[PDB]
Amino acid sequence: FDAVTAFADAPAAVLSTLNADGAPHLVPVVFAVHVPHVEGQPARIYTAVDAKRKTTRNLRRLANIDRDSRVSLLVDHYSDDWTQLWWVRADGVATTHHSGDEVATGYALLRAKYHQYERVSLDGPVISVEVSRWASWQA
Amino acid sequence: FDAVTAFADAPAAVLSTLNADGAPHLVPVVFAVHVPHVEGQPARIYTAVDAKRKTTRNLRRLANIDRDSRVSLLVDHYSDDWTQLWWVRADGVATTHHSGDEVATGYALLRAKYHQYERVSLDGPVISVEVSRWASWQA
Numbered sequence: 001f002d003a004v005t006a007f008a009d010a011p012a013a014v015l016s017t018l019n020a021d022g023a024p025h026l027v028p029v030v031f032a033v034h035v036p037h038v039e040g041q042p043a044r045i046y047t048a049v050d051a052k053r054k055t056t057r058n059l060r061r062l063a064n065i066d067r068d069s070r071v072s073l074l075v076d077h078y079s080d081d082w083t084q085l086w087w088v089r090a091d092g093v094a095t096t097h098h099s100g101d102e103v104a105t106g107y108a109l110l111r112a113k114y115h116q117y118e119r120v121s122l123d124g125p126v127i128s129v130e131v132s133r134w135a136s137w138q139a
Numbered sequence: 140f141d142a143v144t145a146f147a148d149a150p151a152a153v154l155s156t157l158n159a160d161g162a163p164h165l166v167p168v169v170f171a172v173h174v175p176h177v178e179g180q181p182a183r184i185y186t187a188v189d190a191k192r193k194t195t196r197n198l199r200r201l202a203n204i205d206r207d208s209r210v211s212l213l214v215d216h217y218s219d220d221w222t223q224l225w226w227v228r229a230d231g232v233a234t235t236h237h238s239g240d241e242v243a244t245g246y247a248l249l250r251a252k253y254h255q256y257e258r259v260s261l262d263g264p265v266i267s268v269e270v271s272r273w274a275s276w277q278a
């Protein structure tokens with residue numbers, strides 16, 4: 001069982017950020033993982049946001065990250081057979097990018113993973129999560 | 140939409156608690172919801188922690204809740220058809236019970252929901268979450 005691979009291959013993760021008063025917030029995301037092949041460098045998790053400025057929403061995860069960059073993401077596998085349960089969690093620091101190489105990198109990885117991005121537009125900011133630790137569990 | 144029923148029927152949710160340094164901690168749980176048949180009263184979400192065996196992960200989670208009762212739980216539904224995505228979130232205040240009526244109430248609801256508890260033991264503390272707000276989204 002490779003935790004990083006199991007996480008990377010999954011379609012959806014839950015992203016947790018901190019609200020202004022410190023309480024946790026949760027939203028699901030689609031995402032792509034970059035495993036740096038210079039081995040010994042931290043993994044990167046990329047996720048795009050469908051948010052326009054001044055006249056729209058989905059603003060909360062961005063506003064949370066801007067105030068406090070500490071985040072966690074979890075991929076879970078449920079089964080009716082509880083001996084088949086597992087999960088993988090990434091804890092890390094999120095940076096929001098509105099231009100540059102990170103946006104390019106994020107867009108690239110996201111399109112490669114999700115074919116839905118052939119029809120669904122991809123013109124919002126990209127969150128880059130530097131993973132400080134991976135955790136996992138199997139039943 | 141009906142968000143509460145959708146949440147209540149789902150097999151698994153992601154529970155977010157706060158670590159000692161205030162950063163989010165995430166773990167998936169099985170859970171059961173009590174919706175009061177009286178108007179005004181908040182819903183309660185119940186989830187059990189095993190005490191057949193003590194584990195570092197479970198002591199961490201219990202300590203987080205003891206330290207700060209603020210939690211969030213999310214049920215999400217992924218589909219490769221992104222027009223069918225949805226999620227439901229409960230924000231609330233968690234109390235851990237090691238005996239008493241909350242444990243009885245939680246055990247009863249959990250056994251009613253999960254047939255797996257016919258084989259899996261249920262003799263640990265029960266986390267009872269008083270829901271302060273529900274949120275939901277549909278694609």
Ligand SMILES: [Cl-]
Pocket residue numbers: 060274
């Ligand atoms: Cl929201």
Ligand code: NA
Pocket residue numbers: 274275
């Ligand atoms: Na909300």
